[PDB]
Symmetry: C2
C-alpha cells in the first residue's frame, strides 16, 4: 500500500548578501518545514518572504527532496 | 567577502519503507541542519545513521542547496 506524499520541502534563513544565496550562518538557516503537497510548499515560500519584514537578509525558498544524497548507493 | 561557503545541508526522518523514499511524516523530517563544510555535512549523514540504529526507517541523508527552487527568477 504506497501513496505519493513526497514533495519539495521548504528551507530558508538569513544571508550575507541581500539577493545572494550565501548563508551567513548555518544555524541561522531557518528550515520552514515540509507541507503535504509541493503546491502548499510553493505557497509557503512567498508566505514566508512577505511575512518576514523584521528579518533583514532572510530569503526563504524551496528545495528538491525528490532524491536524497546518499553516498551509500549514489 | 562574498565567498562560496554554500554546501549540502543535512536532513533526515522516517520513511514508510526500508529503501523507499516515502516520508512517513513531514513534521517528523528532523532537519539535522547545515555543517560549516561539505566534508562535515557528508560526515553528519553517518554520524546520525550510527546514532539512530534503534530507528526503524529514520534515515538521515543530505541535500544539495547550491540552487534553491526559486519561482522568483526562474
Amino acid at each position: 500500500m504506497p501513496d505519493k506524499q513526497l514533495l519539495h520541502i521548504v528551507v530558508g534563513g538569513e544571508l550575507k548578501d541581500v539577493a545572494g544565496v550565501e548563508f551567513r550562518d548555518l544555524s541561522k538557516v531557518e528550515f520552514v518545514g515540509a507541507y503535504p503537497s509541493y503546491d502548499e510548499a510553493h505557497k509557503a515560500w512567498k508566505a514566508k518572504a512577505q511575512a518576514t519584514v523584521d528579518n533583514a537578509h532572510a530569503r526563504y525558498f524551496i528545495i528538491h527532496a525528490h532524491k536524497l544524497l546518499d553516498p551509500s548507493e549514489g
